[PDB]
């Protein structure tokens, strides 16, 4: 409140300010050698607390060369003996536009173990994906929505893994929990382990003969010299199992959280914001919604998001005006006040694509004890467990929609050639020597369509190095036209097309690679003031992305938010977390920031 | 001093370009036991002539996804290697006489080598090199097989490869452009654009040769290097000094002598 702030100011407190710091460094400095002051001592130290936090109250919507300001380091000086003598990487620094329109930064504190956390490989990674997901095709109208949904699956990562972390009934629970743990700490442990030894798997299998005698009936049995490749084999496929098995536990343990986390989030904000199932009522297509409708009644609907609140929220929101014991029904609330909730979480579950790979891979696995050769088939997971692997596939798979296209107007063409030849080149179309059995591959229409599709596709000059030579003949002339216009067309334009297509996927990610990083390096992802605004000043730019606009500063601040009593918000804290209870993105400064609005006085 | 001698013996045998050269003396030195060693000395033009290094650079700027793609052929043909192998053994038959009838895919090692050397060293796949599956039960499956063949591995992932060698063409030709194009634009020294010079005729271009010359800050390091200390000036020995514990604050970042003084100037 501007009033009490300078009518605190114009007072005389700050007489009344030191009248302690002299008392905190003496007093303190007196009871500390006597071990039997310890109590007084702690109640010096949080009178001192709600001192100190009195004074940074104070310190709320500060302007610079402001009167409050101004008068403070005068406070400080007169007392600096005293402030020595009581004083003998965590601050967290952010701006936003507060009420008053103006840029105002906020002070917090950065616990270690989230700093930590945030330097981890893996959430690096994720910084990473989500950065070039929002820098290559994003909107600038919802980027900040975005940022914060990010900032917010960070934030639950974080407190699973802090979870998991690891530093005749009452036994089995203890013991349940830390062999959970202890596969969630190594699920990528377990990964790499899977995929080396199915490559262990295939090397044995390298060494297999097939004979009709004993190690027609065909006998499927290993061969070689040194006899202890068959029980290698044996061991390292019923460990290979149970790694699989272990691999998808520890997923479920891990990482279906995510996704129940993330489908409860969109949930409720349709419920609240939207309305989906108050209003919008989808009929069939949103099979997602459809299957979101089993899980409205349940008693612990928001069983991983924390908003538990969610449930009053859109009562509030909605009843006033739609009604209060429909909604009380399609809630299951009792308004005077789990099988379907372990449905709706399992049939989720079974929709996600990573759970259903890991499931296909225990299914393979399973099946390679009933025929060994079935354990090839997990070397396709080199396809998905290596970086290097997924970014040059990425070029194959970019274009997959043109590659489709083009080969079926490879067909298409090939048909139109093979109909042509049909009509008019029916002789040379006899792949046997032997007069007694005249092997005609062109006197129907599938056959001809396909030895076309198959050899003048295969081969490197098209269909006139696999027919009959048409020199010295009536159609020569045409077949010379036929076969070079088949070269051209199909052999030479219709393959360069596909290599084309597949060098222009590599130049498209180079360049949007390139482009992410251009961006990033140009202009702050906050504000969006370029870099030559930030430059005048050396390393300007450079600072104010890693201090005074640090995304990552945000998401420690929306943790500290998310994770501190609501009781106990100050000021701009309580105003930063009301705008997030109505997610109004207005406190992220667009095109403003702290330096610009007072040049004058830094300057 | 031995230890300093062995210290320097030892950073030297770690040096790549005096490991090479040993390594052509030895190559010379077995020349004599047998003449064609000194074949080996021809791959001496990859490392001498730029032009050859330059257009080998495009090679080797990609050579872990070259490497990388190398295997995945292996991969894939080892796959198609364990599907031929459960289900197409008759058709590797590679003599033509009924005496000795030689299979080439009754073995997982020989089907694999043959797969890799033969359906990857082929035009057409595999289904060139193998029998014709016309008339036959597992036609309609030889006939996707042999041509998913040739569509994954002889087309796609042959065109994998050209693909990465230009993209590394582009990738070189565009560093050097942009290399080129941030010298002529920006200041080296100050990182002050070009335009800002501009207002005056060729004001870059004196800004960059005389006021902010890199080689003239290389000059006046090596003058304050080479005089004697004690007759260094005020400037001068604010220099060094700001030498000796590396700072390197006195070189204009984002200020320059005419930016500042452009009233008295103008
Ligand atoms: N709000 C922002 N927070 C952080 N970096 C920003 C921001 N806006 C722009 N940048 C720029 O983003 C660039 C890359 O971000 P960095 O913080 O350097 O992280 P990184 O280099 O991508 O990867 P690491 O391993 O975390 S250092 C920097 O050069 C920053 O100048
Ligand atoms: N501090 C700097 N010193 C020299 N050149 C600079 C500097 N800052 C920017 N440049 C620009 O760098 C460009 C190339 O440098 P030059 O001095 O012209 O040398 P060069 O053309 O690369 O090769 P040569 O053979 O030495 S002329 C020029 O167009 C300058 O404008
Ligand atoms: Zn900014
Ligand atoms: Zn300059």
New interface residues.
């Given amino acids: 409140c501007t009033g009490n702030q300078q009518s605190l100011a114009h007072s005389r407190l700050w007489d009344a300010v030191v009248g302690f710091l002299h008392v905190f460094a003496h007093m303190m400095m007196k009871l500390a050698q006597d071990s039997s002051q310890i109590e007084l001592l702690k109640e010096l130290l949080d009178l001192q607390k709600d001192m100190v936090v009195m004074l940074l109250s104070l310190l709320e919507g500060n302007v610079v060369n402001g009167m409050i300001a101004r008068q403070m380091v005068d406070m400080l000086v007169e007392s600096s003996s005293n402030v020595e003598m009581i004083l003998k990487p965590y601050l967290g620094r952010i701006e936003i536009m507060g009420a008053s329109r103006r840029i105002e930064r906020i002070y917090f504190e950065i616990s270690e173990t989230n700093r930590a956390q945030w330097e981890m490989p893996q959430v690096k990674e994720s910084k990473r994906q989500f950065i070039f997901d929002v820098v290559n095709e994003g909107g600038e109208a919802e980027k900040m929505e975005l940022f914060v949904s990010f900032c917010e699956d960070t934030i639950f990562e974080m407190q699973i893994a802090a979870q998991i972390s690891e530093p005749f009934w009452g036994e089995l629970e203890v013991q349940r929990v830390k062999f959970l743990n202890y596969l969630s700490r190594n699920f990528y442990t377990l990964r790499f382990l899977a995929l080396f030894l199915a490559f262990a798997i ?1 090397f044995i ?6 004979s009709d005698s004993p190690p027609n009936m065909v006998y499927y049995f290993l061969e070689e010299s040194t006899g202890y490749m068959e029980p290698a084999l044996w061991c390292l496929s019923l460990l290979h199992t149970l790694v699989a098995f272990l691999c998808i536990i520890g997923y479920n343990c891990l990482k279906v959280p995510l996704v129940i986390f993330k489908r409860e989030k969109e949930l409720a904000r349709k419920l609240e914001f939207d309305g989906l199932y108050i209003t919008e009522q989808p009929g069939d297509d949103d099979v997602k919604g459809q299957w979101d409708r089993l899980v409205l009644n349940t008693p612990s609907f928001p069983s991983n998001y924390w908003d538990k609140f969610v449930k009053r929220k859109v009562l509030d929101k909605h009843g006033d005006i739609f009604g209060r014991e429909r909604i009380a029904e399609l809630l299951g609330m009792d308004l005077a006040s789990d099988v379907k909730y372990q449905i709706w979480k399992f049939g989720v579950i079974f929709t996600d694509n990573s759970f259903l790979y890991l499931g296909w891979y225990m299914v393979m696995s399973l099946l390679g004890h009933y025929n060994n ?1 079935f354990f ?2 997990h ?2 997971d ?1 396809a998905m467990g ?1 970086k ?2 997924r ?3 990425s ?2 798979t970019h274009n997959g929609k043109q590659l489709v296209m083009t ?1 079926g107007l490879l067909a298409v063409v090939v048909y139109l050639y093979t109909v042509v030849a049909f009509n008019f080149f029916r002789k040379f179309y006899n792949k046997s020597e032997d007069e007694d059995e005249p092997d005609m591959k062109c006197d129907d229409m599938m056959t001809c369509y ?1 030895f076309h ?2 050899v003048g ?4 000059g098209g269909i006139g190095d696999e027919i009959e030579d048409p020199a010295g003949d009536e159609y020569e002339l045409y077949r010379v036209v036929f076969d070079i216009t088949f070269f051209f067309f199909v052999i030479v334009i219709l ?1 360069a097309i ?2 084309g297509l ?2 222009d ?3 498209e990610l ?1 360049d949007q690679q390139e482009q992410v990083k251009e961006d990033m390096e140009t202009k702050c992802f906050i504000c969006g003031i370029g870099s030559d605004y930030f ?5 300007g730019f450079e600072t104010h992305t890693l201090e005074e606009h640090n995304l990552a500063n945000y998401m420690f601040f929306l943790m500290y938010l998310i994770n501190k009593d609501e009781t106990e918000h100050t000021g701009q804290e309580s105003y930063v977390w009301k705008m997030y209870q109505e997610r109004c993105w207005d406190f992220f400064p667009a095109g403003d920031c702290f330096r610009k609005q007072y040049e004058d006085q830094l300057s």
């Fill in positions: 295939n299998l390298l060494f297999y003969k097939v050769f090839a088939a070397l396709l080199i290596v290097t692997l970014t040059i596939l070029s194959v080969v396909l599709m198959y596709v295969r081969a490197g393959l596909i290599q597949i060098i996927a590599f130049g180079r430059d005048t000043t050396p390393h």
